[PDB]
Design a protein around this ligand. Structure first.
Ligand SMILES: [Mg+2]
Ligand SMILES: [Zn+2]
Ligand SMILES: [Zn+2]
Ligand SMILES: [Zn+2]
Lengths: 84, 268, 551, 156, 107, 171, 93
RNA sequence: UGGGUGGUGGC
């Protein structure tokens, strides 16, 4: 109906900072609610530093749904998008 | 007035309805903080200055590269196979000079706010790679030409492959590619700055990455930042100027107080 | 957790369907018909059912639960009532649009004085915008003077041939002037609202669709009120005058005045009526319904209270700077704020703000009890609420509040994985920081927490330029996040190191101020020499110095 | 709680309400005729689905009281066991061979097609009474339908 | 219009990026005529109903909201604030899913 | 009356469930929550088709709460009765006020005023039944009734039958 | 936390902070809607757990929301002035 | 733990 295949993807393949902000907030909220961490834990035990330790390595199980302004949307995985 | 304007993931500018306002954000796609005023060097000066700085000549010996700076200098003089490259590129820059002279920046004031400032990267590579010496280099002219020409098709602002995409791509970064070829032409690099190969490849990769990192971000609520950042000098500010002139320009009057003409006369 | 559980699932609003209300749907939504002007029974302790304070509407007393929803006052939204007016009235807010509508159509059959025959009208039909559609029909019909009996063999469209009157507006009272015939007596007469109701009930749905309305949402016999609803008393709750007597809200006074004029209407048609005693009591009913929604109508004196003050309408509860929207919805007052007077302190970083201890005691932050923060949070319990660094509450997994000023036994409390604890304002948290008024997008900037005695706010002095603060007594506020999400929002966008460069003028707007600047210019003049010994300290002060003096 | 694709009931007058219109829509938006199931069809689907779910849980390795234990929760065990025994004692065509034969014989509203299969009948008189919707359709063979249906009906 | 704004700001030495003035002068000619900044400009747009009601004249424009059966899909900002919603910008211009792709890659 | 119905269920998952078996948990959760339940809108949901292959989709993270919202679409066999619908049944009990008949999931009550007059309740008989001369309705008797009223508790539905009409009665 | 504070929050854009401010540290308030006539007339008994849109005889098409108590105040004020805000939770066109 | 008016002072 709306959705586009993952090959016509003409939006920018970067994370930008607003996207980055929401990913950090939501991943940190999950790991605050006892979602176990994929990366090592040295001294970074506060959840925001845990989230930046993940995004440093690009280890994030989320999906951006950019609503393109028709209404359709490009399901970008985190794994493919280039971390700034 | 503006409180919804959001730059979306197509580089356009819509309200809540979808009244598109600018097809490309700020006519360039570039984030508003990320500029400096630089000097597009191929605007000012005479034809003598341009033809002395840039015009390569591979038949006459002395107007070519003075051979102290390059290693391969035995392998050069006379070859029309490379002369036609350089004549095409000199005509390229005459096209750019006519372009930036007669279309865009007509009165020739060359200082303009334009993104990522390359000169700083050049001298950063220079101080990194110890670039005195006054030494032969192994970096060839065809690698310069193909580096510039293979640069000017890697500055994707508007990505995708439809016809208006490629057209809007070339409409987008014409001035920025004009800047790069206004600086990194062959006689300027291989005389006035004296790079090597490895410095030049690092220059190419870094101009790539930072003109990628100064694209505008999507969702920058540019109307709101715009409205505040025009209201802010309105805080601290015979024709009417200042706050009532700003008020009349906004609240648009049919009766402003003292209108005016700018009437040129003809040249004779 | 802050709400009691329900089975209907949470969804956000997507589409506002604005529309009008039928008299029917008002009669079908309520629970009680409204009758009696007195509030009390006979001043006898639970006032009169049938008066205005029906406990089936929702009780505005803490200790008597509601008698329709069966909840407390904390949860009952209220329930609408409605007062059956005997005489139908105008809604006060539609009288120009109702004016235009009775300018449009026939007054006998109620049909539009144009069809698709006249082709400019036939072009105006094609418009997808309702508003300028009704503008175009309003334009082309104001010149058409006669209801065509014929189609504009008799093709009788529906009209009788009687002319169409000229619609004036006079406040609440309309004056239609037919050209009752050429020239003969013009009967400029008051358009009684019930006559127009009987007109409006005779409209085809096509004339609804052409004239800028919609049938299942805005049917223009619904712009005349037969039944004016009663809101539940949360919207007019009684105020303790001096802690025994309740002065009422002015809606209660006005609905009482409406119900009194209602009964004095129904008193006249049940006995001998001298025919303008009818007219004045009806016009008084219309007046009371007018001032129920608006006490600002032009030309007429205001509705007045028992002090000499005007009455708080519904219109006065919505317009103005301090209405519900600009004063309560678009912007409002909130909590977890703080506020003081500031002081400079150059012995600081750029993203640090001094916190007086008592403000750290009062405010808090809910840190989640996780598996990586149990020990300190248990210690912050063991400081309790009179000792920084510490805690004030444990919210359980369900919604249990334990105020630790009112609990003897912190020592026997284990905590569970996933409970919630609000500890105090400890170091290194985001705070928002902010000075009224905001003028550019740096005027709110995030920071970090440094805890100091001697109760004022500390700053760096390089941040003096963006907020535009001096130190002759400014107030700067301090909002606090109450979630993890907003913490990361602030820490990645509104932090000072990411807002250095203002797109106002594509330059840094946070620089050097008075003393550091004029001092460094006095320092690095050419003829300034320093002995080695003082230089030892001076290069010790740099946090980023490696450990190597220059030559 | 649970919702569907669609966003006075009288079975005699074929008024089945807003949920069971003639044209339904699947989870892709495609149009589809209403799927009304005879007692015999329903017996096949329910039994197949229950044993297929049990096989999938066993990685790929009969009785109704055992087949109904595949469900989760005592409420589901109850409704399914009560439904199988009802279908076990009133499904005329208790195998897919006969069932497809009845399918082709009948393939006219989808509700009627399921009723004719579920309710055994002798004559046309009994069919137009119990299913008063077949009145004004005017296209019988009905009798040989009922005769073939009754002949296809296995003994018990 | 642009020449006017750049004049009367930059008379007192003060400096403005092009793209902010550009966005202002292009919104002022979105619709082929000067959509000036008053109630007459924004409220005579067919945009979101409460967004237009939040600026001026909220009584009349609410009466024209309910008076003509408008459908406000609430994509304006002020709606989504006063309906207490994830507003559509910043972090909320776009939803975030869970991912069966990467959680299949996970053990 | 049995149907195949395309249904869906909104499932909200707490972040502590964001583990490697998330999709399988949701599929089991759908079955536990939907199978055997009754609603007046669809009826009894008897069994869900293809339960182990249900596509649960992707979970949308709810802003401000961290939890994920899945819309689990599925197709089930549903049973809803109708006023006017003739059905067969098995009588479960007989009492002085009529009898109760099991029609699949639910139970139908037929009262004495909706039983033909010649059928007389005989308690002395063993086993107790409503009897005539050539009629016999005891517990376990196949009967054909007509649903004349459906009442909905949203938990269990209640239907009242009748055999006071043509071709209805014992079979 | 006035207007122009919300303005600079919009300029930063992190609206999730704004949904903290104007929902959660304020009059967080919970209402119900019947999904057919779209209104909040639905009477809420909870320990008996039953509901009735009495203008519709609707007993199933019921959702709750999370709106500011002053927004609910707006809605009750308007319905007491006969304008009908109806909140449908799906995009229609 | 009142409302509602009104006055003066702070940035
Ligand atoms: Mg000052
Ligand atoms: Zn109640
Ligand atoms: Zn007429
Ligand atoms: Zn309803």
């Amino acid at each position: 109906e709306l959705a586009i295949l993952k090959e016509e993807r003409t939006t920018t393949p970067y994370l930008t900072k607003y996207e980055r902000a929401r990913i950090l907030g939501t991943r940190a909220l999950q790991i605050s609610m006892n979602a176990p961490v994929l990366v090592d834990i040295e001294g970074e035990t506060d959840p925001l530093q845990i989230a930046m330790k993940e995004l440093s390595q690009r280890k994030i199980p989320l999906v951006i749904r950019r609503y393109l302004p028709d209404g359709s949307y490009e399901d970008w995985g985190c794994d493919e998008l280039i971390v700034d | 007035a503006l409180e919804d304007i959001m730059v979306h993931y197509d580089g356009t500018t819509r309200n809540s309805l979808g009244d598109i306002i600018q097809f490309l954000y700020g006519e360039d796609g570039l984030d508003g903080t990320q500029v400096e005023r630089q000097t597009i060097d191929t605007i000012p000066g005479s034809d003598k200055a341009f033809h002395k700085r840039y015009y390569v000549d591979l038949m006459d010996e002395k107007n070519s590269i003075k051979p102290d700076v390059i290693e391969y200098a035995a392998d050069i003089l006379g070859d029309v196979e490379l002369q036609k490259e350089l004549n095409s590129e000199y005509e390229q820059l005459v096209s750019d000079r006519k372009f930036l002279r007669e279309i865009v920046f007509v009165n020739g004031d060359h200082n303009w706010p334009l993104p990522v400032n390359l000169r700083r990267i050049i001298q950063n590579a220079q101080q990194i790679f110890h670039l005195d010496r006054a030494k032969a280099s192994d970096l060839t002219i065809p690698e310069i030409i193909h580096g510039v020409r293979d640069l000017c098709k890697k500055l994707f602002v508007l990505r995708g492959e439809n016809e208006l995409i490629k057209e809007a791509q070339q409409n987008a970064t014409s001035l920025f590619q004009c800047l790069v070829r206004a600086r990194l032409a062959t006689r300027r690099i291989l005389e006035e700055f004296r790079l090597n190969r490895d410095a030049f490849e690092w220059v190419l990769g870094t101009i790539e990455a930072q003109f990628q990192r100064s694209l505008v971000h999507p969702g920058e609520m540019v109307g709101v930042i715009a409205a505040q950042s025009i209201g802010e000098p309105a805080t601290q500010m015979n024709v009417t100027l200042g706050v009532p002139r700003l008020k009349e320009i906004l609240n648009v009057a049919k009766n402003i107080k003292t209108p005016a003409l700018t009437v040129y006369l003809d040249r004779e | 957790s802050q709400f009691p559980y329900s089975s209907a699932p949470l969804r956000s609003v997507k589409e506002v369907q604005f529309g009008l209300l039928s008299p029917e749907e008002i009669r079908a939504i309520s629970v009680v018909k409204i009758e009696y002007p007195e509030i009390m029974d006979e001043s006898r302790q639970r006032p009169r059912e049938g008066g205005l304070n029906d406990p089936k509407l929702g009780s505005i007393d803490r200790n008597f639960k509601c008698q329709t929803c069966g909840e407390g006052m904390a949860e009952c939204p209220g329930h609408f009532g409605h007062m059956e007016l005997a005489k139908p009235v105008f809604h006060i807010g539609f009288i120009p649009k109702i004016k235009k509508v009775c300018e449009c159509i026939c007054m006998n059959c109620g049909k539009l004085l144009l069809d698709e025959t006249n082709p400019t009208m036939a072009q105006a039909i094609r418009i997808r915008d309702p508003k300028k559609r009704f503008n175009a029909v309003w334009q082309l019909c104001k010149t058409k003077m006669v209801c065509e009996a014929d189609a504009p063999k008799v093709v009788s469209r529906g009209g009788c041939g009687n002319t169409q009157p000229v619609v004036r507006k006079d406040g609440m009272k309309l004056w239609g002037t037919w050209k009752k015939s050429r020239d003969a007596q013009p009967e400029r007469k008051l358009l009684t609202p019930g006559e127009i109701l009987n007109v409006f009930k005779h409209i085809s749905p096509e004339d609804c669709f052409r004239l800028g309305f919609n049938e299942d949402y805005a049917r223009p016999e619904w712009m005349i009120i037969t039944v004016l609803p009663v809101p539940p008393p949360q919207v007019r709750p009684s105020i303790a005058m001096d802690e025994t007597t309740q002065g009422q809200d002015d809606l209660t006074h006005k609905l009482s005045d409406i119900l009194k004029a209602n009964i004095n209407v129904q008193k006249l048609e049940m006995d001998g009526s001298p025919q303008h005693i009818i007219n004045e009591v009806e016009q008084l009913l219309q007046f009371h319904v007018a001032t129920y929604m608006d006490n600002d109508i032009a030309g007429q004196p205001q509705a007045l209270q028992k002090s000499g003050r005007p009455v708080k309408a519904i219109r006065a509860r919505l317009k103005g700077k301090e209405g519900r929207l600009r004063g309560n919805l678009m912007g409002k007052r909130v909590d977890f704020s703080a506020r003081t007077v500031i002081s400079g302190d150059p012995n600081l970083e750029l993203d640090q703000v001094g916190v007086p201890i008592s403000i750290a005691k009062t405010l808090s932050y809910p840190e989640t009890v996780t598996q990586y923060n149990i020990h300190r949070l248990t210690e912050y319990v063991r400081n309790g609420p009179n000792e920084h660094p510490g805690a004030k509450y444990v919210i359980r997994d369900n919604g249990d509040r334990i105020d630790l000023r009112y609990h003897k036994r912190a020592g026997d409390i284990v905590l569970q994985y996933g409970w919630k604890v609000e500890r105090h304002l400890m170091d290194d948290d985001p705070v928002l920081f902010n000075r009224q008024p905001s003028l550019h997008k740096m005027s709110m900037m995030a920071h970090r927490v440094k805890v100091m005695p001697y109760s004022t706010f500390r700053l760096n002095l390089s941040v003096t330029s963006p907020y535009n603060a001096d130190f002759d007594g400014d107030e700067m506020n301090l909002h606090v996040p109450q979630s993890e999400e907003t913490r990361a929002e602030l820490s990645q966008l509104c932090a000072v190191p990411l807002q250095i460069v203002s797109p106002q003028s594509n330059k840094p707007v946070m620089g050097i101020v008075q003393d550091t600047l004029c001092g460094v210019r006095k320092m690095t003049l050419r003829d300034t020499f320093i002995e080695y010994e003082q230089v030892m300290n001076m290069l010790f002060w740099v946090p980023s110095w490696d450990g190597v003096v220059p030559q | 709680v649970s919702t569907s694709t669609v966003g006075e009931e009288n079975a005699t007058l074929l008024r089945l309400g807003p949920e069971f219109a003639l044209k339904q829509y699947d989870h892709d938006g495609n149009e589809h005729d209403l799927i009304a199931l005879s007692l015999s069809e329903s017996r096949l689907l329910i039994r197949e689905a229950l044993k297929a779910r049990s096989r999938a849980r066993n990685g790929g390795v009969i009785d109704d009281d055992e087949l109904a234990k595949v469900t989760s929760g005592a409420v589901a065990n109850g409704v399914v066991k009560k439904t199988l025994d009802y279908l076990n004692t009133f499904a005329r065509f208790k195998d897919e061979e006969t069932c497809t034969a009845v399918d082709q014989l009948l393939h006219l509203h989808p509700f009627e097609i399921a009723q004719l299969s579920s309710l055994g009948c002798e004559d046309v008189d009994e069919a137009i009474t119990l299913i008063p919707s077949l009145a004004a359709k005017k296209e019988v063979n009905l009798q040989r339908i009922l005769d073939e249906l009754n002949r296809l009906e296995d003994p018990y | 219009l642009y020449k006017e704004i750049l004049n009367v700001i930059a008379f007192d030495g003060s400096y403005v990026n092009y793209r902010h003035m550009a966005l202002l002068v292009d919104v002022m000619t979105s619709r082929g005529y000067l959509m000036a900044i008053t109630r007459h400009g924004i409220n005579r747009a067919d945009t979101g109903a409460l967004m237009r009601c939040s600026f001026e004249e909220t009584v009349e424009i609410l009466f024209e909201a309910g008076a003509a059966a408008e459908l406000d899909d609430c994509r304006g900002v002020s709606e989504n604030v006063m309906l207490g919603q994830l507003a559509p910008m910043g972090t909320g211009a776009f939803d975030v899913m869970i991912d069966e792709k990467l959680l299949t890659s996970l053990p | 009356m049995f149907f195949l119905k395309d249904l869906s269920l909104i499932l909200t998952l707490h972040p502590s469930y964001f583990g490697p078996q998330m999709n399988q948990y949701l599929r089991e959760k759908l079955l536990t929550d939907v199978e055997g339940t009754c609603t007046g809108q669809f009826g009894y949901i008897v069994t869900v088709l293809d339960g182990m292959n249900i596509d649960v989709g992707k979970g949308r993270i709810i802003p401000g709460s961290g939890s994920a919202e899945f819309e689990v679409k599925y197709r089930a066999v549903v049973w809803k009765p109708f006023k006017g619908e003739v059905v067969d049944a098995i009588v479960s009990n007989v009492s002085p006020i009529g009898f109760f008949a099991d029609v699949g999931p639910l139970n139908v009550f037929v009262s004495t005023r909706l039983i033909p007059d010649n059928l007389v309740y005989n308690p002395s008989n063993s086993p107790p039944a409503y009897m005539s001369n050539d009629e016999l309705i005891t517990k376990g008797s196949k009967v054909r009734l007509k649903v004349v009223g459906t009442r909905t508790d949203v938990n269990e539905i209640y239907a009242i039958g009748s055999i006071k009409e043509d071709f209805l009665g014992a079979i | 936390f006035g207007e122009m504070e919300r303005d600079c929050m919009i300029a930063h854009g992190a609206a999730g902070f704004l949904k903290e401010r104007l929902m959660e540290a304020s009059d967080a308030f919970r209402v119900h809607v019947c999904g057919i006539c779209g209104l909040m007339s639905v009477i809420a008994n909870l320990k008996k757990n039953q509901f009735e849109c009495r203008s519709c005889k609707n007993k199933t098409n019921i959702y709750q929301l999370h709106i500011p108590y002053a927004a609910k105040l707006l809605f009750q004020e308007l319905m007491a002035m006969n304008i009908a805000p109806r909140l449908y939770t799906e995009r229609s066109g």
